[PDB]
C-alpha cells in the first residue's frame, strides 16, 4: 500500500529528473553535420546449405569466421571469404533460437526452446565438434547468449531472467532477475563489465556483471523489445522493438536520444547492430528488407533487399568491413 | 589459383554439402507435429499410446512415415514470442480432456477449464502463423466424461446449451463448439477424435489426418489447389 504508492512517487521523481536534464533535442544538435547520403551495399557472398529457417548469426573477431543457427539442427561455421563451410555441428534439439561465437574462437554456443545452452569445443584434439558443456536451469526459452570469455557467458531466457554462467563449473554464478517480461536479446559492452538486456515489457535494463544488480531501466518503447546492441564506445545502445521504431538510449543521459520511425513500414525489428564508427545503424526488419539508419541525421542511408523471407538476424563484423544478414529463406548474404 | 589447402578446404565444404542435403531430404520426409493443450489434458497419456524441461520430442514410425511430435507444455514463457517458430509444421495435435467442465482452476479467481481451453484453441486456430495448418483435435477422458455427465449436467456450468442431458448429444455439442471457433474453415480442417485409452486407432487417426495434409501440400505443389 504505502510501499507501492512510494514506488509511484519515486518513478515520477525519475520522470522529473529526465525532463529536467533534457534541454536540447538530439536532432536539433546534429543538424550541423551533413547527411551521409545514399549508401549502396552490394551482395558479395551468398551462403547456401542451411535448408531451414535461420535465426541467429555471430561474427568472429578475426572478421572472417561466422557461426549460424538453422532449424535443421545444424550450426554451420562459415568461411566468409571463400564461401566454404568450416564446421557443421549436429544439434540434439532442432529448435535453436540463438548462437554465439567466442572471442578467442575456441567455443560456440547455441540455445533455444530446449532451455539448454550448449557449448561446443572447436579446437579439440579429436577433430569433431563435440559438446563441452550443457548449461541447464532456465525455465524459459533461450533467446540470446554472448561469450564474455572461454569460461564465462551471459544467456537471456524466456523466464524473465538473465544469468552469468561458469562454463567449467556448469552452474550459474550470478542470476539477473527483475524483468516483468520475457527477455529477448542481450549485447556485451566492449569492456564486458556491463550488459543491457531488452525484455517483452518494452524495457531495456542495464546490468552489471560483477555486482549483479540493475543499474538503469529504460522504458521508451511501446509493446515489446526483440533486439539490442551497444554503441561501439560503450555508452549508448540502440534498441529494436515490434512497433516499427528503433530507439537510442544513453547510459549516462538516461533518456531516449533518438527514435527511428518511418511511416510506410509498420512491421517489427528482429535485429540491430552498429558500424565500426557507429554512424550507421543497420536494422533487420520484417518487410524482407534491411534499412541502414544514420545514427545522427535520423534518415535512411541505404536499403538492403533480396531476402525472400524476413531477416531474422544481423551482425556487423569487428573491423567493420562486412555485414551479414540472415533470413528465413536459408540464405546468408554478406553486404559490403 | 587455389592453394593446396584451399582446394582441400573447398573439398571439405563439398563433403559437408553432401551431408547437409542428405539430412535436409531426410528432414523433409519426416512429418513434424505440434502437441498443444492444457497440462491435465493427457499429453503424457496420448504420447505413450502412440509409442506402444523444454521440448519433449517423440519419434514414432507408422506405415513408413516418420513422425515428430513436439511437446511444448513444459515452458512457462509467453507463447506469442516463440509461436512463430512452428510455422512450417504439418499439423497441430491439440488435446483437451472432456471431463474438465466439472474441474475448477487453481487460480483463486473463478474460471472454467472449458472456457480456458476454448481460449487456448482460439489463439492457436486464429493465429497468423497457423493459417494453412490443420488442427488434429483430441477430446480426451470420454469415459470419465460419460460418468460425470449422468451425475452432473452440462447446462449448469453455462446456460447457453439447452439440449437434453445425453452423452452422445453433449460430446457432439462440445465437438462443434471448438469447430465454431475456427474463423477460416475453407483452408483449415479440424480433425476430431474421441479417445479413452484407445489403441492404434489413435495412431491411425493421426496418420489419416496427416495423409490429407500431405495431399493438401502435394495439390498445392501441383498447383491445382
Amino acid at each position, epitope marked *: 500500500d504505502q510501499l507501492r504508492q512510494e514506488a509511484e512517487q519515486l518513478k515520477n521523481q525519475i520522470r522529473d529528473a529526465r525532463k529536467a536534464c533534457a534541454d536540447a533535442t538530439l536532432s536539433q544538435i546534429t543538424n550541423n553535420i551533413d547527411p551521409v547520403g545514399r549508401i549502396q551495399m552490394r551482395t558479395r557472398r551468398t551462403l547456401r546449405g542451411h535448408l531451414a529457417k535461420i535465426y541467429a548469426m555471430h561474427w568472429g573477431t578475426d572478421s*572472417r*569466421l561466422l557461426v549460424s543457427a538453422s532449424q535443421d539442427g545444424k550450426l554451420i561455421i562459415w*568461411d566468409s*571469404y*571463400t564461401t*566454404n563451410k*568450416v*564446421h557443421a555441428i549436429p544439434l540434439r534439439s532442432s529448435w535453436v533460437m540463438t548462437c554465439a561465437y567466442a572471442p578467442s*574462437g575456441n567455443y560456440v554456443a547455441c540455445g533455444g526452446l530446449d532451455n539448454i545452452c550448449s557449448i561446443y569445443n572447436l*579446437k579439440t*584434439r*579429436e*577433430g*569433431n565438434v563435440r559438446v563441452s558443456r550443457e548449461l541447464a536451469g532456465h525455465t524459459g526459452y533461450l533467446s540470446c547468449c554472448r561469450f564474455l570469455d572461454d569460461n564465462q557467458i551471459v544467456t537471456s531466457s524466456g523466464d524473465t531472467t538473465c544469468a552469468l554462467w561458469d562454463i567449467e563449473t556448469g552452474q550459474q554464478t550470478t542470476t539477473f532477475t527483475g524483468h516483468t517480461g520475457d527477455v529477448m536479446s542481450l549485447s556485451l559492452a566492449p569492456d564486458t563489465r556491463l550488459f543491457v538486456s531488452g525484455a517483452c515489457d518494452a524495457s531495456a535494463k542495464l546490468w552489471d556483471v560483477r555486482e549483479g544488480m540493475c543499474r538503469q531501466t529504460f522504458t521508451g518503447h511501446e509493446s515489446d523489445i526483440n533486439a539490442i546492441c551497444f554503441f561501439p564506445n560503450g555508452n549508448a545502445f540502440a534498441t529494436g522493438s515490434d512497433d516499427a521504431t528503433c530507439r537510442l538510449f544513453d547510459l549516462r543521459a538516461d533518456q531516449e536520444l533518438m527514435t527511428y520511425s518511418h511511416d510506410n513500414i509498420i512491421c517489427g525489428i528482429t535485429s540491430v547492430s552498429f558500424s565500426k564508427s557507429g554512424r550507421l545503424l543497420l536494422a533487420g526488419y520484417d518487410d524482407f528488407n534491411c534499412n541502414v539508419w544514420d545514427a545522427l541525421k535520423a534518415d535512411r542511408a541505404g536499403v538492403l533487399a533480396g531476402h525472400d523471407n524476413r531477416v531474422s538476424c544481423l551482425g556487423v563484423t569487428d573491423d567493420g568491413m562486412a555485414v551479414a544478414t540472415g533470413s528465413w529463406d536459408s540464405f546468408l548474404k554478406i553486404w559490403n | 589459383t587455389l*592453394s*593446396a*589447402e*584451399d*582446394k*582441400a*578446404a573447398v*573439398e*571439405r565444404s*563439398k*563433403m559437408i554439402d553432401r551431408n547437409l542435403r542428405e539430412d535436409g531430404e531426410k528432414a523433409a520426409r519426416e512429418v513434424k507435429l505440434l502437441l498443444l493443450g492444457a497440462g491435465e489434458s493427457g499429453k503424457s497419456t496420448i504420447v505413450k499410446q502412440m509409442k506402444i524441461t523444454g521440448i519433449v520430442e517423440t519419434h514414432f514410425t507408422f506405415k513408413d512415415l516418420h513422425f515428430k511430435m513436439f511437446d511444448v507444455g513444459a515452458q512457462r514463457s509467453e507463447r506469442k514470442k516463440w509461436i512463430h517458430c512452428f510455422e512450417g509444421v504439418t499439423a497441430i495435435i491439440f488435446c483437451v480432456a472432456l471431463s474438465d467442465y466439472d474441474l475448477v482452476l487453481a487460480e483463486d479467481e473463478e474460471m472454467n477449464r472449458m472456457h480456458e481451453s476454448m481460449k487456448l484453441f482460439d489463439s492457436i486456430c486464429n493465429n497468423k502463423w497457423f493459417t494453412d495448418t490443420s488442427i488434429i483435435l483430441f477430446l480426451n477422458k470420454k469415459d470419465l466424461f460419460e460418468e460425470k455427465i449422468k451425475k452432473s449436467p452440462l447446462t449448469i456450468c453455462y446456460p447457453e446449451y439447452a439440449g437434453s442431458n445425453t452423452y452422445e448429444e453433449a460430446a457432439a455439442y462440445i465437438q462443434c463448439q471448438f469447430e465454431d471457433l475456427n474463423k477460416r474453415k475453407d483452408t483449415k480442417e479440424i480433425y476430431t477424435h474421441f479417445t479413452c485409452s484407445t489403441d492404434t486407432k489413435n495412431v491411425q487417426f493421426v496418420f489419416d489426418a496427416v495423409t490429407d495434409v500431405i495431399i493438401k501440400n502435394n495439390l498445392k505443389d501441383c498447383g491445382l489447389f
Partner: single-chain antibody
Amino acid sequence: VQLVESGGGLVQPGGSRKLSCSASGFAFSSFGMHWVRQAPEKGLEWVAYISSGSGTIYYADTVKGRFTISRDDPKNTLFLQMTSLRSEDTAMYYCVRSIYYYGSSPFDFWGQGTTLTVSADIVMTQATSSVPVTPGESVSISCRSSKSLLHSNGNTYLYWFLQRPGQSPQLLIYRMSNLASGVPDRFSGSGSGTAFTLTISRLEAEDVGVYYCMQHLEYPLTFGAGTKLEL
C-alpha cells in the same frame, strides 16, 4: 589420439606388401591421411596423400604408379598397397592426420613408424646441417625455398617439424606463424618467401633434435634436409 603402423619386416625387392595403420581416439573419416618416409641416414620425404572421403589422391613423381593408397572409414584403417618395391624404399613409413580448414592445424599428429628393409617442384634448402648449441642461448634455424611460398590470400605454407632421436616427428609451427597445440611459446617462426627463420628463446634439453622445413604450396610435398642440434 593414437596411430600405430603394422606390416614391416624384410621385403624382397619387387615383392608386394600391404601396410595398415589403425586409428584410435579421433574421427578418422574427417582427416586427410599422409604417408611420409624417412631414410635411416637421410631426412624426411613425402609419399602419398588421400583426402577425407577419398575425393583426391596425390603422389610424388618418384613414387607414382608403384604405390597405392586407400582408406576405410567404417574400420578406421589406412591401407598402403605397395607393388614392385625397389632398393630406395628402405625407409620408415609414418601415418599423418591432417584436417584442412581456415585456422586448422594439419600435420599435427604423426604415427609411430613401421621399419621397412629391402635387401638387394619446390626444393627446400637447409643452410647448416648441424650447429652445436648450449642450453640457454637463442638458436637461429633458417630454411630457404626454391619458390616464393607467399600465396595471394596471405597464407605462407611452411611447417616446422621437430624429430627427437628415437621418437616420432612432431609439429611445432604451422603456416610459419602459428604455434601448434602443445608447443611452448619459446618457438617462433618468421620470414617471407624464399627466406625463413626459426627461433628458440630459451633452449631446453628436450628441444634437441632434427628440425625439418616443409612447403605446402603445391604437390608433391618436399621436406628439408633437416638441422641437428647437439649439446
